[PDB]
Amino acid sequence: INFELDPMDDPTYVYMLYGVFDTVRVNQPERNVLAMAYFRTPFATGNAV
Amino acid sequence: RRRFPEPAVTRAITARFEAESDQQPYAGPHETNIITADVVRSGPPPSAV
């Protein structure tokens, strides 16, 4: 991505937002068993440890 | 004094007294049922999808 901006007078960020499906489905099979699976379609965070 | 039980009789009486302890070295049905119960509910659940 290449941006061209009007020069401002102080350091500014460029708040960039992609489009992601950061969805979670909650599995509760039995009593006091709570499990969540997080998945984000463009930008996932699975490190396979 | 001569009515003191012979050693075999004393052995039988002591074994019978020990059998009613509830604290035998190995698990009876009471103890083994709960030792099975807690191992069943230990570790990752089986029904967790």
- Residues B45, A27: C-beta atoms closer than 8 Å: no
- Method for structure elucidation: cryo-EM
Q: Does A33 touch chain B (CB under 8 A)?
A: yes
Residue of B nearest to A35 (CA): B48
What resolution (Å)?
A: 3.4
C-alpha dihedral sign at B30, B33, B35, B41 = negative
- With vertex at residue B45, the alpha carbon angle to CA B44 and CA B48, rounded to the nearest 5 degrees, is 110
Residue of B nearest to A28 (CA): B48
Burial class for A44, CB neighbours closer than 10 Å (0-12, 13-18, 19+): exposed
Instruction: Tell me how far apart the alpha carbons of residues A21 and A42 are, in angstroms, rounded to a whole number.
Output: 7
- Residues B47, A35: C-beta atoms closer than 8 Å: no
